[model samples]
Target: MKFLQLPPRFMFFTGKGGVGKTSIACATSIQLANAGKRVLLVSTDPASNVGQVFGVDIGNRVTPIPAVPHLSALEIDPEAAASAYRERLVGPVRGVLPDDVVKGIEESLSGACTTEIAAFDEFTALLTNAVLTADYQHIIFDTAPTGHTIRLLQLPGAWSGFLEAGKGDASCLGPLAGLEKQRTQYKAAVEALADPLQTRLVLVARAQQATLREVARTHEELATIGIKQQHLVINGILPSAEAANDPLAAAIHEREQTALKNIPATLTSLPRDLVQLKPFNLVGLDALRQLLTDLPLIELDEPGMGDLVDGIEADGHGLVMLMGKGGVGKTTLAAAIAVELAHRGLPVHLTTSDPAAHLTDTLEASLDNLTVSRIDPHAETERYRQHVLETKGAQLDAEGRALLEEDLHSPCTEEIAVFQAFSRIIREAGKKFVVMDTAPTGHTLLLLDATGAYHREVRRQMGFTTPMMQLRDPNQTKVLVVTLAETTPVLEAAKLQADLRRAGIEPWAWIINTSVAAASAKSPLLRQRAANELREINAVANHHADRYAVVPLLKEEPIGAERLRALIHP
Candidate 1:
């Protein structure tokens, strides 16, 4: 019921995406604002839904939350921030450089890494620029820089700051060209973060094994970045009251307890709080308050569950991309769907884009009708590298071939190469069922960006539409976004859907992956969680997704064919 109190200045909430970082951070902002502190809620998350949660238009500017007094919110738009920052450098070059040279420079900076760094650049400006935040008493950031960049911020050595580790050359940093110009600003931002008195990092997590493992990794990584003032928030703990009733509810509560018991020793040293699950979605101001209030219980209702996909089935053939924030069980969901289809005598190709391929672990054994494979980016890149050398090297001089080989070392090469491998497999979907488990939202966006880039190139070269453009077709692809019955996941999943929609692909249906509502537990904690899930389920069905299905948390692990069938039916 209690929570770790934050420093009155800047508080950052971060963890695996589905964890309640956004909700808790927003609630704390409201709590501080209610106490008469002028507060600013800034969402540094590239994909933000702070505006949606607050039910106001808090775009890329600092806008007031309509009804929340003394509180203003800003959702940092990475594209806009990058464009503005990009123009600051490009504007000066327009008249100074030749057209071809300027275009080449622009092309170098145009990448996903550029967008990421640009967002971070805008973020650091806030922490260092006191004038911009002078009016606010408290500033809550929903997301923070990952371990890689945070470590770079701590480096006192010469200019390798925001770029990759071990690469000392500035030219190697294609997306980080203009960052050197902001040396003074970057120094101040890193200083503010390292000074524990000025900033506080809250590690938010759910009471699940995978999330705890990720939290441990994050905790250790941040510790190395001089962020010792980290606090742990174990959000959405199932209530013990419900544990004594239904067997499924009791098993879930026990599972949570076991997960907590087994979390790594590094986390054991941090001061932490366990917040009991609530019965309402963390949406409007009303529900946000309840998130901070003493934990409340929920009464059991009619067996609520994952609503069925009204008009369609995931059965036939095509690519079913299971995507969302990590730990929302995208891999498991994809396995379930694949296994279910295979059970029904359909040939299914199950694959994943994540570097850590655990699809095999999720499946007890491979079914005869199902072919399990993984997209190994490294291997694919090597294959692509060989292919390029064999054909392109024939025309090039030795010097030119060497230069082309060096360019392959660039990070963008991996993006493009992996995308080529992805497209090759994508073609197979037209023949049979292909259930793909995509990486988390961030990596998924990188792949999507590559698709866009490839679409442009092929359009110019072939003078016709490419296979990348055809990925948007409903007949070829069905994107199934998976999420939990919580705040951050739903918000992030909404953003993922929006991004996919922008790329001309419509999400087929939302899979509310782990819902207590559908599980229908009678225990107090689980019942409360189930009650809370109602609004989020409604949010998915009524607001975000047109066609959707809810998948309840099964007491048994959804491994093998039979367990997968249970998931499909439920």
Candidate 2:
């Protein structure tokens, strides 16, 4: 019955992964459309299933929301964006460069550069080509975790800053030959990003201290590039009126109150709209109305949730796993937790069993006493290739070896290669706190399935039961399932938790990160979403005592060591 409201302009929902960004973005867009304003919504989440949410098959292409009239929604396929960008970048030079050189260039581009550059290309029209900005009044961007978005936002400035500095070399990717062309593109992007009026930047977050801290950090960074006058969204604020009567909701309501009370002075100053907790899921147009009605209202709570993991350190080496779908803050949570523990003088080996890991990027400059490393899938795959080469390649003729090499190059080969690396790391957790931000759910299940695959290899040679048990045993390993507090994120997290349980691994707890709830609100969208998340989190453990915790949304984006350390349970 309540809500927060913002100008029907650019309502970008972003926070920790799964923080209901898409839902908020979509809901806001739909509400705007209903208000007689045309709206276009888009997503850059690598794991986005925006189509599923909207009940429409949308893709990288912009399309009308057939399910909902007067609205357009799209899932901006970052890969497609990258592919198109790559084509454009190489179109003129296709005949000039050798195939091998092109491959090297593409590979170099494959890292973060490809993703950001490509997405920017898709958005170039937001500046250069715009029937929408002039035609439609609002544009909602559903973004990825801050690490990617901030970097994406900073690319133009960072890139142009480099060009301006005459650092004179291709920075992230390598060297660029067509400096003039790149300069043009980079200049265009900088102009777009720096133009804060047409492009309003909104930071989505929860009432939790850490998430807000991350928002402040991001806001400050964006400020340097002239992206000022930002919109702050503190979602998942619980409704005290309703929560007061319901015991289950009541307890959460009080917790939020305490946290709101403790909220650091740095956060109270932001211009924000808070979304409060809703009784049911915020899906479709009906739910969107609920959020619109509830966006601007809330009772602020205290800041601290105290210590989430207080004395559970002796539970068999305390192997806390940061598990969730990709792009959620799992890796950061794992890194922050590891950093916090080590800072308190614990000997921690923070390793990732996830094959496709961005831990290097996420924890890049913030790493401290933690020996941060990943089980390199390429290296593992290479070992397997070499073994095959020795055992089979040596006996086979050159012709046969060529065919074998082809098999090794298959796309799925990386899966095998990475799983093997996981096997090694899992075995090393006997005496150390092995905090692993596991691979994404889809990939993690593949790991668990393949867990059996590698066992066949190791058992045929040596019976290493103890080593294997160290990795998979529930008693020895604790799974800290992380997710954003939103419809899809909570759903995905719960689904993952279920599968983990089905696999005989009991997750230690579910953590809803960057959420608003019954208390802590500056907006109705966030509050209702928080209520929705609490339901999802409770469903993960049946809302039983001590099965879950909520991390408030931050006011700043977290990056580097200083920022990452702020997320710890300090």
Candidate 3:
């Protein structure tokens, strides 16, 4: 078996959630290490499973993998990096500032700001710190998912823009005092991202419609961020053959075909490549060895769907809600789970109360008897808006009331609107097996917060309300908290579970979706991923196991009527 020889330096791979960026990155690293280059592979995703992929207990330390010749791996821990950065930034100035000012600054840096900003700072530390520059013959980066990666890329802009603007602010750290020394280095890193000779950005995605479309949008977004040199990694390629024998497989083929037919034209300009289907889990050195040998990714054309979604179960077991951060494939999995149950002849009413209606896009086509509907954000907003206005408006005179109208547009109002729609859907669970394709982590928590806050705040009221309308009772609702096999999302998912409990909703169960662990993916990075999953799944289950299950990454994207079923049950 032979492999495509790749350069030994600065190979960065990124993609949508669960698309094999880590597996491919690890494979490339192993192949290079075999060729005698001193390789250092690193992941910026704090939740990266690179260490677990090889089954090693590695951390922020950059150490050689003794079992493998010429290779070393390390993870850039976001929390550690952030804590260190915070200490460095605040430690020196602590005694010089007033107590109130220091308190406000620390508080400002306390929440998500520390997490995101520190992770980006770590990236700066990796590239700008000269010590790392001269050490390795080749550097491979398993980057964060699209959102985080794009944010990392844009960070240079934010810092640069801020420093550029600071030259004019007398109250600011003088333009040259703090940022002048770093300007040259930051500019170089930005150029390194665009320099075809120094770095390669591989944009990966599966054959699914939504995933590919997202990649297209992300690629465009990054282009605006000064990144121009990139490649594509098309993972989970499937074997095209006679599908008649396997009804489920046939459905997958057709669904992918339809997606291809309607392929978003925006991505057509980018250079593309493919990896074909092989019948084994790709994980660890051995799995990767087989994958490198299995090269020439099976490139095949797609099979079109006969129609949009079909085969949703009209009725079935208790409700299954694909609850997770938005874009983690909750809707796709929910559709698949429903389809699979329907194929088994179960009466499953697969429905969604997600406000954004992403279920329509994620589902792509209808599943058998699966009915999809999202809670209307506008309607939800209006109901809450009217309730607030009625009471608040009563307190003000006509002139004071006019001023309150402008205040109505505040962010607080939007939260009430969205959660109102969400609660309405949960209420439907008692009547059907309601499957919700929820908003992503941050927003979902905000929605839960809205529910709880509203619940408490509303209890003080006198009439039947929207808060009571949704959680009128908890037994009628069954929440399925969906998550990936990686660390960040799982942690976020766990945080989400806590939020749900605050709203009196323990996730009915936890579903670990789209894992390379189940597929035996060949990449030590996959292990780090699996470990994180184990940690969270165990954490959620050990704490709540009576309600947890794992779903393997499908041989194909979970689309079309039949393929959706295969994902849920098979």
Candidate 4:
């Protein structure tokens, strides 16, 4: 592979989640280790599955992979790291400060920003700590999803600059307090990252328009940040040979080819490589070994989307959320469900964060019972900033207000803004069926983290119900976890399920979207893939999910209301 042809010391495999970044990173690490080079594989993903991929338990600390010679691995548990970080910050003030004051400090450190900053702290150490990484020749990072990874990569500069500016009263003051000692370490790490000889970013993506477009933006973003050494690995492209017989497979190949032909101009310049979709799950060493180079189902009483909708419709009105990694068709599925409900003469309000204008056009011929709205993140965030400045900043003097405005500039502020907008719409669910196509799992979890924090704060004082409480009540909200039938997507979906359950919100059901097995493909390659999905499908049905449905890979994109309604019937 071009990406692995002549590698640097630091390789970061990052893209949208469920895009085979972990599998590719593992495969790359193994190949390098087999060449007698010492490699340390580190996963910065919060919902990491590197241990599962290698069939071992490697967490936080660096653990040698017994199966692979000259190789070791570490999964940075963000929650654990955050806990340790919190203790470090709060321990000193526990008895020194009042009980309520200490509690306030702890609460400040409880949000997702702390977790990310804590993980990034460890990540910077891996890059700049020569004594720590002296044993390894290559350090491979299997980073979190795109948004989180970008924020992580950008933090070294953001924090270093923030500290340099002497910004004390910031929104993330609790998390930043511990970083004062690591300023030099962070600066060195930033220099190492910006140096091309030391770092090479492999932008992993699937062969789809949206995925490619997002990767293009990622490519530009990283370059602008001075990390210029980069390569594109288009993982999981459906082989053209599979399209010879099956109409469904043919359609998919055509779509992928079209996407490739019109590949983003920015990405067309990069050294690119394509990894065909493999039939087997990317678990165990054997599968990992074959991933860089390269399934059937059984009959079961499986449920469909229509069946899940029936249960949802029985509730008359409530909040219905579709969530998973990006590119898993959450928007399409959410729209389908909303359209179906509206078809039944039910009051349904469908809201999405998708910036694509096509979604508005797709539902142009709107249903009388269905009302569509968009949660424009940028607009919402701006509105939130103005509101906060008006209310909170109104009480502060000029100097205090300047610090508050700087604090508002923190990344966490966007989460707060979006959450408030979401809370507003959530109340509408009480009157009508509110179907929300949420952001990707990582971002959604952060939003939920905000919800959870608000819930705790409200409960501490004299309080009524909050949005988090509404979500935890299963009768009021149905959270559908959406994923493709592929290995990474399935594993990620299961992890999302576990995360939700941990948050006191039980996922109502799982939807295995775009399944070739469910579609019953005829081509040999597709048939093999279909068969391979049986294991994951069974895993979801028997192990992970309490209730689930399978949505088949359609011959065409389900865009308009007619086609979307057909998804329910199909």
Candidate 5:
């Protein structure tokens, strides 16, 4: 709580997906508001659930939470922001330029990068435009996962330098073109981010090993960018109480302790605090009141694996994509489904796009009908660059070829290349079941943006409609949105579902993975946690999703073929 006592004017909650960033940020806002300081809570993620947590409908603009005095909340709408951004750039030139010339400029400004930069522009204004937020004493930001946060934070400097040097020809910097007039404002925003007196970045994490490692990496990366005013919040740590009575609960406690003890060396230096795992759902004002209270772990019987399997059973196979925030057990779920389908005598191709290589361990071994593989992003990217150079550059002169190669080296190239690789596999789904464990939600969206961009151009070039047609069609594709029975994960999944809907893809079902409520448990702490999960479980089953299935937490790690089958079957 000391971290909250003398808080700066700006606080950003960022870390791996589903690390309780939204819950923690909301609680901090409540505390600050109750202390009589006006606070503004903002969610910068495209998949934001800030409104859902408060049980209010806070749209793109600022809205006052009726129950919470002195607190106002806002959720930035990226699409709207981009539309307005485009107008700001194209408005003046509309009447002054020729129709064809104006059309080309407008097209150039449209892309995933434009949407991102547009959102960042809105965020930068929040930091630099004092008059706009002068009513608030403190501003707390609930940012997207690590990858997106890093990009947004770094953009001010990236664009400022590029524009200043007068080499701002990159396609990704299109949204930033008109903003060079406000270079001083952008520079001020970057300065505020690095000033410890004005800002504090809180790195949120769970007591899981993989989550901790990811947080550590993010911490180090931010430090390199001069945002060193950092603190660590180790959220949802299990209590040792009741470990004596229940073997499974005891194992859970032991595993958490082991992970905590071996905290990544990069994170050891930060001032850190542990939020004792709560037994109650963290939603609405009442739940936020008990945010810091610790509780002991109980559980009820749920449905069997057969019904869960039947619900996801594909009548005709094509593409099956498992996606959500990280650490929600997407790899495990994907493997289980793939193995189950293969056992049912279907031709299944299991693949992963996450660079972590975690999927290999999730599957015990490959089956006759199932072939395991991964898309090496780096390898594909390089191959794409080389291929482009040889084919496209062959006819170009020396100077033109050099320019083309330089452009290919930009960060955007990798996204396009990886997208190409993904599309190739998606096409294969028509012949067999292609089970894909996709990258984290943020990364996966970037790939989709590339697809959207391609589809726009291909619309004019070819008679074909969408290369992602298989994924867009329900009969040919099954997209599963995975999540944990926790506040952040559920909210993130909701946002992801909205994003998929925007892309013309309906998620087949919501899978609440590792729910103690569905699995039997005895420890008071574990039992309490299970009770807490009920609210979120109900939220998904009744409101957020069209169809959903719950998976219980297993006593043993769900690894290898036997355990995986037990997982869906249990």
Candidate 6:
């Protein structure tokens, strides 16, 4: 409630994905609307569920929420906006240019950067265009996950400078074509965002060390960029009372308490609010209404993590990727799966981006058939930049080389670099179990887009089997979509599945990780939470995933080789 105390004209709720930003934003909007204020709630999240929260289908345009008066919502569908942006750029040249040239242009425009820029185009309009937003007293933005959100917010300044210099062609060329006209509007948007009275940013996070550390960094980054009016919301904290009976609940409560006790120094001074975990899913009107103020079930012969590993082991040697939104335990699950396979005397290689070194170190020393490696984005990107400069920029003039460098500086460069690193490791799967803890959903999708682009380009030239083809081939690669048994995560995971399918990659199975229900909790509060998880679990089993596994919430973090083995065996 500290975030909503002194409401501003514009409020943006941002944090890691699956951290309850959308729910909190919806709750805030509803609270304001009920207090006789007209509000326009806009979601800039790629995997937005505002419509689901409100029980209404609010898409690209503002649609009045019929259930709540004085409240209207809009979901800035990034894909739709990007498609329109692509058409605008590609349309004029369609008939004028040769077929292959036009196709090439379209492929160039198809990237995560283009989608972000296109969505940002729509986002800025709401902030600066008085005519369009005059009807609403307040506008709340449910922004995307941390990295993407930061990039989106920084684009106003980034693009403004890029346009002022007006000197380079980069990856964002197609998207930047229309930005010239909106330079003034973008400046105004930037000014509006920096003004304390006009905008307040609520940094939503869970009571976890890693998440809070990330938020602390986000706080400093935003503050440095002049978004000084900020508040912190530690959401979904389990009540202390839940710890009395269940050891799992007690361990979680203790862990959360420790995290909060040692919260990052930079965040200690911020106005903070803690929202207790709600037993029920944050959906429907009543649920939204109660979220700001106050806050399962099926016994099935469902498959466990062991079963999923069994299927993977059957292939003997192949790529097994665990992917989902951040904070969903993909790294832990990937480690567990790798450890499980290695324990069975199978050759396994685990690649991860886990900042914590203990787990990988312990596993590497203990297992003979298992090897661990990390894909450091920064290192890979730097390597990629030098490689490009030496190879592709070798023949360029000074200005041309500078332009190439600028293009490399674009956000897409990191995606390409990371994809290349992954590509190198992916080949090992042909001879051993290559278990990868892929990046979060958004970044992973971007990498896949780059892969798809590569695949297309290769086909156009003289076709050779690429990583994309390997990923698309089920016999060679298995993508296990990991998610928690909660509404938003499940929804996001399902969306990820749909995206994978569109990219011609079929997910092999779904892993519902850290399920309280699967753990069979004894505490009342945990029982309530457990009961609530049934619907989502049922959805995953019967609808979303063709095959799935449920991993129970454990009393301890599955870190070392032994604990990881317990994760698979339990």
What TM-score, to 2 decimals, does candidate 6 have? 0.87
Question: What are the TM-scores, per candidate, against the unseen true structure?
Answer: 0.77, 0.59, 0.61, 0.88, 0.84, 0.87
- Ranking, TM-score, top scorer first: 4, 6, 5, 1, 3, 2
For model 4 the local lDDT of residue 487 reads: 79
- Per-residue CA lDDT of model 4 for 1-570, tens digit only, reads 998877999999878656778889999999999999999999987667788888888888899999999999998887778788889888987898799988988887776566666777888989899999999999999987676687678778877787677754555546436556878888998898899889999999888776787788788888988898789988889888788877888888999888889999999898999998876778888888887775211353478888899999998889999988766888888989999999999999999754332256446577879999987756887987787778777888999878777876765455556667778888899889999988677657766653465344222221135677888998889999998877778877888888788878889999988887787688877788778887888888889887899988887778789999998997
Q: Model 2, range 45-97, lDDT digits (tens) per residue?
A: 65565676776778887789876677887776656776777676666667688
Candidate 4 lDDT score relative to the true structure: 0.80
Listed per candidate, the RMSD to the true structure in angstroms reads: 5.3, 11.7, 10.0, 3.7, 4.0, 4.0
Model 2 residue 59 lDDT score: 81
**Candidate 1 residue pairs in backbone clash:** 239-525, 242-523, 242-524, 279-532, 305-518, 306-550
How many residue pairs clash in model 1? 6
Structure candidate 5, residue pairs in collision? 296-524, 296-525, 297-523, 297-524, 297-525, 297-526, 297-527, 298-527
Q: Candidate 3: misplaced stretches above 4 Å?
A: 1-8, 93-108, 167-182, 241-245, 250-269, 295-328, 333-360, 363-479, 483-506, 512-544, 548-570
Give the alpha carbon lDDT tens digit for every residue of 368-437 in model 5: 6888988776798797778788877788899988776765665555555666677777778877888899
* Candidate 6 stretches greater than 4 Å from native: 90-113, 166-168, 171-178, 295-301, 342-347, 352-377, 450-466
Q: Against the true structure, whose lDDT is highest?
A: 4
Q: Give per-residue CA lDDT, model 6, range 407-502, as digits (tens).
A: 677644554566667777887788889998876676577566534553342222121345777899999999999999888789879889998898
In order, the Cα lDDT scores of the candidates are 0.71, 0.62, 0.59, 0.80, 0.78, 0.79
The per-residue C-alpha lDDT of model 6 at residue 167 equals: 34
Best by the TM-score measure: 4
Clashing pairs in 6: 296-530, 296-531, 296-533, 296-534
**Model 5 ranges with Cα > 4 A deviation:** 96-100, 129-137, 156-166, 171-176, 182-187, 293-317, 325-327, 339-349, 353-384, 409-414, 439-451, 457-467, 485-506, 528-548, 559-562
Which ten residues in a row are the worst by lDDT in model 4? 455-464
In angstroms, give how far residue 343 of model 6 lies from its true place: 4.8
Q: Cα lDDT of model 3 overall?
A: 0.59
Q: Give the alpha carbon lDDT tens digit for every residue of 414-502 in model 3.
A: 44455556666555566556666655454445445443444432332211344333432445555667776555456557767776777
